[PDB]
Design a protein around this ligand. Sequence first.
Ligand SMILES: [Zn+2]
Ligand SMILES: [Zn+2]
Length: 227
Amino acid sequence: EYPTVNEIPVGEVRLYQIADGVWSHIATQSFDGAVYPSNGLIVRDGDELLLIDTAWGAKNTAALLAEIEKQIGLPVTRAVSTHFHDDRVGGVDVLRAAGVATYASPSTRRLAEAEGNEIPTHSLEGLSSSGDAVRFGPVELFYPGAAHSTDNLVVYVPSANVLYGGCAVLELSRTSAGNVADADLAEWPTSVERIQKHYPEAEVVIPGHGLPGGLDLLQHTANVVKA
Ligand SMILES: [Zn+2]
Ligand SMILES: [Zn+2]
C-alpha cells in the first residue's frame, strides 16, 4: 500500500513508514506532459528530523511540513538535497522560511544556481569524488559518481539498512531512464555498480520516483540504462 499518484490529491503529500524512525514522503508534480510521484526521506535524528529532498515545488513542500507535524510532531531541523533538480531543491525557500537549515554538495549548489533553481544554504564537505562517503547525523551520504546527474548523491540509513537512491535509481516498472538531459549515460551503470558494492546489506531500496523494493532496483537500473 505504497502511495501512487492516483492516491495523492493535488498539492498533497503522504508519508509512508519504511522502518522505525524512517519514513518516505510522496508527492506529485506535472513534468513533460504527465503527472509523476516523487520520493523523499525523513529520518529521526535524536529529538529532531532529518529531511532528504523537497517534495517537488513550494506547494508540495509546505504540505510536507504540515504532514510531518501532524503525523510525527518532531521539528525538521536539517534538509539535504540529493541533486540540483526541482524534485530535490524546489521548495528550499519554504524550508528555509520554516527554519530548516538546508544542505547540498558544492556541486549541487553551483548547478542549482546556474539552472535558476533554489539554492540550499550550506555546503556538504567530503563528497567531491566518486566513492566518497560522509556521516550526516543518522545517515551516510555517498557520492557514487555521475548517473542521472553529475552531482547525484545517495543516502543510507544504517539502523534499518535503508538505501535511498534518489533519481540515480529507477523503480522496477520503469521502462526508460526518464529525464536524461543532465545524465551521464556512459558513467551511470558504473556509478550504480559502486552503490551495489558499497551497500551489499541494503534491505529496502527507494527510487527517486515510485515503488520501493530490494537490491533488484539497482540491477534493473543498470539494465535499463545500458539499453
Ligand atoms: Zn533529476
Ligand atoms: Zn527525478
